[PDB]
Amino acid sequence: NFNFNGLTGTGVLTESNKKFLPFQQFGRDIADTTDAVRDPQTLEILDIT
């Protein structure tokens, strides 16, 4: 389960290969479902499968 500084849901965690611009903390796919997230404290991108 997740609660990343308010972002919640469920999934399997693996490292992401999606880069975020300084403007964004979280990303979404086609149909707007959250996939990749930036860790609230660590500047790395994590994928929620």
């Binding site: 999606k18 880069k19 975020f20 611009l21 300084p22 403007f23 964004q24 903390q25 979280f26 990303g27 979404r28 796919d29 086609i30 707007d32 990749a36």
Partner: protein, 238 residues
Amino acid sequence: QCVNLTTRTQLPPAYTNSFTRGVYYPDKVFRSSVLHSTQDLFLPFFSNVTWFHAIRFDNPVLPFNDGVYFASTEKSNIIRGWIFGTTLDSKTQSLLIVNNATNVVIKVCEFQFCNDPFLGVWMESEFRVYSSANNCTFEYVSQPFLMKNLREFVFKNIDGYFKIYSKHTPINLVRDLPQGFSALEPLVDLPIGINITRFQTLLALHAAYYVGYLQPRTFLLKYNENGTITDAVDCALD
């Protein structure tokens, strides 16, 4: 410590200014190759953006219609700030936003502002802007936005929350805002807790600036393959 110039330059509060594709990122969400429809306050494209001459300092208190955009083009960073609130005459609180000591400093309080406020310049001083303040609500400090370079900002106040987004590029044309796509990055987010219906500009004295207004319209933001915005449409402008 005010200079007592009270220049009171008298020019109409209007200007033809070509302006297009000036948006801010509405969220912190990254989308690849997605056209995003967002309903928020943005400056309508080709809307009235008033250009004010300055030191003879043209700086009337102007209406804040939902929110505003500001921009200026000066190498020395002579314009140092903005003042926002219902009256700006010490009867209500206002938001004093300044740029000095290579940082951005914001204070929300009831300030005894001078009719033609200047930052002192050496030692710098805020007392040439206002003599005192009381009944204070909030303070905020952030990184400088400095880099003739153009500094474009959007100022919003939603239910007591104040936001600034900005973009900085070199500019050759200073008679009009530059054209082309520009998306602004968030700089501040404050619980100021006040009514902004009016605003005024703060200038350092040894200066001209643009100001527009926002409307609650749908914008189509065209996102690129890696989440940046490359274009924009102002819904029902024409």
